[PDB]
């Protein structure tokens, strides 16, 4: 099934803000905000989900 939820890019056209609102990815890595995880998934064609909010 899934071990979390899909990371959204919040209608960001080119990039994300530097808002610090950390999410824990299903890879065990902290992403500074959800949107850099969404663009990371777009650029690498990966499917890291969000386990939960907060740092890992």
Swiss-Prot record:
The record marks 20-21 as: Necessary for sperm binding. One of its GO terms (cellular component) is extracellular exosome. It is found in: Secreted. Disulfide bonds join 9-38, 16-35, 24-56. One of its GO terms (biological process) is regulation of acrosome reaction. Transmembrane segments: none annotated. One of its GO terms (molecular function) is serine-type endopeptidase inhibitor activity. Residues 3-56 form the Kazal-like domain. Its main location: secreted. It comes from the Eukaryota. Keywords: Disease variant, Disulfide bond, Protease inhibitor, Secreted, Serine protease inhibitor, Signal. The record marks 18-19 as: Reactive bond for trypsin. It is linked to Pancreatitis, hereditary: A disease characterized by pancreas inflammation, permanent destruction of the pancreatic parenchyma, maldigestion, and severe abdominal pain attacks. Serine protease inhibitor which exhibits anti-trypsin activity. In the pancreas, protects against trypsin-catalyzed premature activation of zymogens. This is Serine protease inhibitor Kazal-type 1. It comes from Homo sapiens. The lineage of its organism: Eukaryota, Metazoa, Chordata, Craniata, Vertebrata. The gene is SPINK1. The chain holds residues 24 to 79 of 79 of the full protein.
């Amino acid at each position: 099934d899934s071990l979390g939820r899909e990371a959204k890019c919040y209608n960001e056209l080119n990039g994300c803000t530097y808002e610090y609102r950390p999410v824990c990815g299903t890879d065990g890595d902290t992403y500074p905000n959800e949107c850099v995880l969404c663009f990371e998934n777009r650029k690498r064609q990966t499917s890291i989900l969000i386990q939960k909010s907060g740092p890992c």
